[PDB]
Amino acid sequence: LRPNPGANKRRKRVGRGPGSGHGKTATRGHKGQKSRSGGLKDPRRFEGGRSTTLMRLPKRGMQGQVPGEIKRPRYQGVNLKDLARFEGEVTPELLVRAGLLKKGYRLKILGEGEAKPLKVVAHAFSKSALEKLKAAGGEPVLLEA
Amino acid sequence: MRVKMHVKKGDTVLVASGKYKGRVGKVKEVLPKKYAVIVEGVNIVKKAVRVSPKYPQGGFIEKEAPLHASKVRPICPACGKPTRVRKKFLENGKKIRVCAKCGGALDTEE
RNA sequence: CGGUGAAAUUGAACUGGCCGUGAAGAUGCGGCCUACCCGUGGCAGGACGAAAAGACCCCGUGGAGCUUUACUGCAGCCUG
RNA sequence: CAGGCGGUAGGGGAGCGUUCCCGAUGCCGAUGAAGGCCGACCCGCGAGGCGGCUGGAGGUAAGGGAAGUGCGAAUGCCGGCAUGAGUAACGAUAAAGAGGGUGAGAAUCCCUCUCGCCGUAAGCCCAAGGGUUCCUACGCAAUGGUCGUCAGCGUAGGGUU
RNA sequence: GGUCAAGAUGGUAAGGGCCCACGGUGGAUGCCUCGGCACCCGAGCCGAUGAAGGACGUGGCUACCUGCGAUAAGCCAGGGGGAGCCGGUAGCGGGCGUGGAUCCCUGGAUGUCCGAAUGGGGGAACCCGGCCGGCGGGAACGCCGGUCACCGCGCUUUUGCGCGGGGGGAACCUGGGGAACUGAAACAUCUCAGUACCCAGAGGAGAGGAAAGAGAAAUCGACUCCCUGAGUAGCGGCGAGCGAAAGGGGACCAGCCUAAACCGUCCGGCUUGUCCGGGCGGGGUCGUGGGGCCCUCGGACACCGAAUCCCCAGCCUAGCCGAAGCUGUUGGGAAGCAGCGCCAGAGAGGGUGAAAGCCCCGUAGGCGAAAGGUGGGGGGAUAGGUGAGGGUACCCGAGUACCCCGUGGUUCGUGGAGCCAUGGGGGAAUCUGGGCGGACCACCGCCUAAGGCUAAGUACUCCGGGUGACCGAUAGCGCACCAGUACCGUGAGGGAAAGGUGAAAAGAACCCCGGGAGGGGAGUGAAAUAGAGCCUGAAACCGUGGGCUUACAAGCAGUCACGGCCCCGCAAGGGGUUGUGGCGUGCCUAUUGAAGCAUGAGCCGGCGACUCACGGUCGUGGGCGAGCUUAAGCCGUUGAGGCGGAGGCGUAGGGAAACCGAGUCCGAACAGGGCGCAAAGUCCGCGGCCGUGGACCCGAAACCGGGCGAGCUAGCCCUGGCC
């Protein structure tokens, strides 16, 4: 019976009509009622087409794969891991499958600060990966179908 | 005050009223409880007709409205009405029992 | 005189002429000349009189009705 | 101390009532809910209290939430009420005047007496289509373009085989 | 005191102007409802035993609203039920009933005439007819009556006996056929869209519904509906735009069959032997066999989609109880202020003359109950019919698959364009069979087509119940109660208004002007400025009285000043009223621009227009940085929230890609651009804000669909008359 919205929250701009005294809202006739006019963009659309193109995604719906999920040895070792075996499987918490564009696809070796690899078998190890993987101390592996 | 009722010809009390002096309930409807306690009317200073004396002004005015009347009165006045325990083969006897009691036995009085 | 008892148009108006003036044809703003209160039966000038958001127009990459060997098809005819 | 403060379009800020939702119904109230009617304390305002009259029962907020909402104004929408107007108008230039009568009142009903216009129709007739009414008896506040004790008007009853 | 010359001021309204009092017509309207509307559950078929839907009837005395229909305010029987009823009329004039009367329900009976109508016709609701019965004056007449389409449907070819349908229905529903606008700011591909609408038809819900499927993992496994799947994959004057599918999360989870010659059986066949035809079957393919020969076989658990029957049949409408106060008291009132005493697994609400747990209410408390009409459950029985192993020459689910063009689907608009689907011509395979993944070819894989049946989970709303930061009589259904009727239109078709007197009728005897209305009194009563259109009852406009004011005056208005009146006043002074004067072009819209002579504007009153859903997007108020949770399952007066972890957004990105990767594509180039740079977002809200949706609001020419009319008018046809 008291806690009114703290700061501002509550209705901030449902400003009614056009002006305390006066009122009318905008320009001249060009924007009447049935006036949801030249929408998004006129000459901007000209641009839109304005150019040949080199990106063609043809008559279809069934592409292959080579799973590009950006994973980071940095989140890993900085503070959420097990320096030898984690595997795609163990990466749930990992913020490299817990987002959206390929959750379950493939975890690559964002080899960065300090070493730059992966000491846990898997798939996605930058070349830089293979190398600092070998330095950091890791057993990486990669079986198929 | 519905398809169901309170007392009938009965004999009862006037709480919120002007009389309280209970007495003969000459008639009581089914829906509008409309009941006449023969306890407060008028004259309708009649037609001027020979319907009433050629020189008229009806007398017995008695349409009893309000329902704050304290129906039923055993050796007890204001009391609700019980129901049954049957007791006998085929026994409704929704007689009135509370504190004192009265059921309007078909005898000595209604 | 008596019985009767409507109808558009219109801010409200108590609304002279002037010479002037003003968006450029004014009772209503300027300076000035006459002229009190009211009403009837008339006379048509103004108040752009009423009347209908001009059928003159323009304008609206508006509509609709012919048309023509404009554009595309439909019909029916002719035809492997 | 600056220092500024005409100012639509338009952009920013900040308040106003307004009917509902909690209203953690507080209740207030027949010594009145409410809307109303009037008023030289409150508000920089949108509003406020408060006083007085009406008026018959509601109404509601301390704090916050929800919105068919605040309107001259759109030849607007619906309902009133005005205006020329007590002038224009009464539906045909086929005219009517009297006497007595009945009546609460009769230019405007009834008889009867003078009189004009139809007559080739303002004739009768069948039919159509109307479908009450026709009659007889009461009545007129509505209706006839005022009348009106008259009616094809209102009330009732009977009426065509 | 009188005469004359001069000057200055005064009152005197027919009406009008501002102010005050008091009326009237007008209904705002505050509140108030047996009335809507919104969501959710319940419910979901009517009809020839001629229905839905109406015409004319009856109520002693009734136009009408009612219910019945000719046995007509109803008769019968059973279920229910407490003592009153002869519906809304209360009035008249008569009644039935505690030897369950009014009435609530379930099954009863005639059940007028119309309406599918059907015995025939016909402008429906009215006129005709043929058969047996009857009565009357017999025959002729004429009534009750039972009687007599049509359809296709199967049965005895002769019953033409015995069935079926048809006729409806607010919305949902399947297929049949199927359109312009508007967008694409033109517009012809395109678009709205397979949308509106005409139709046919099965239902109570149909729809679809056991795979020549998916999809590529050596995977799934009916069909339907929800969330997600991307609005990506993509379709395209690649433009406006349009836009999937497997999977995953969820819900709901039966699967079952027939001709399929072979068997034999059989009857008809033709014509006889050994072909076809049609009945019984075993076979009667579920994810593949089925049949016929040889051998191992085999001697009790399975119910349907109602197989089916009996039940606690859920209800239908009637049921029942059921908690505790009185004294006082201010009041016309109290249920109120006050006193003490009271209930509570039931302080949900309404109702009893102003606001009660203990007063009215058969409610929340809990419980109740029936011999009819409906079944899921739980279980039984009824159980058709399913339910083995190898061997062997094979014959045994469709008449067209398939391929040419002509077309439909589909996220496909013509394309390299696949699969299903059909209009033309071609024109076959039995499990080495044949369509399907990749136009197509070589593979593997997939499924088993060209028959059949149905449940269960999303839709829909006529009808019932309930709840509403959903409405109050101009909003709500237009419609709150003799509104889908008044009334306009030819028909099609359009389509109002009017809610409240009061607490209860005690609503007005009676006297008085009057033809009447209506007007003064008496009584009403708490009021009648509560008096019958009669609550609250304001603005507008017209009225009766009072104050100031007004006849040498030129001005929207006004209004600053002041002076004369009159007013409350203690004075201060405050009111209203103005004559003298100063200065003052009225407001809205669209205008370079308005006094307008440009416009809107008649006056009052109530209505009267920047929203909602998402997408988003930027802000900013709030939770953790990885942050947040749909569809559901579950607990839920209050119904209490909890859980549900298919996801989408982040978390490097760079590229047409191959990919590489914090690096990177160009590239043979150490030169640039996307960065690296986290400088964490992610979610909830509130809000400026676009995109789609009618998105400030009402506004047009018109285009398109389906119907409506020749008593419209011109024509033509038939048929009288008149000149």
Textual characterization of the structure:
The structure is cut from a larger assembly and holds chains A (145 residues) and B (110 residues). With 145 residues, chain A is mostly helical. Chain A contains four helices and two strands. Chain A has a two-stranded parallel ribbon with strand order 1-2. The termini of chain A are far apart. In chain B, strands 2-1-5 form a three-stranded antiparallel beta sheet, with no helix packed on it. In chain B, strands 3-4 form a two-stranded antiparallel sheet. A two-stranded antiparallel sheet of chain B has the order 6-7. Chain B starts with 10 loop residues before the first strand and ends in an 8-residue tail after the last strand. Chain B is built from no helices and seven strands. Chain B is mainly β and 110 residues long. The chains hardly touch. Chain A binds three RNA strands through helix 1, strand 1 and helix 4. The PDB classes it as ribosome. The entry lists the keywords bipa, ribosome, translational GTPASE factors, protein, X-RAY crystallography and cryo-electron microscopy. The entry is titled "Complex of Thermous thermophilus ribosome (A-and P-site tRNA) bound to BipA-GDPCP". Chain A is 50S ribosomal protein L15. The organism of A is Thermus thermophilus HB8.
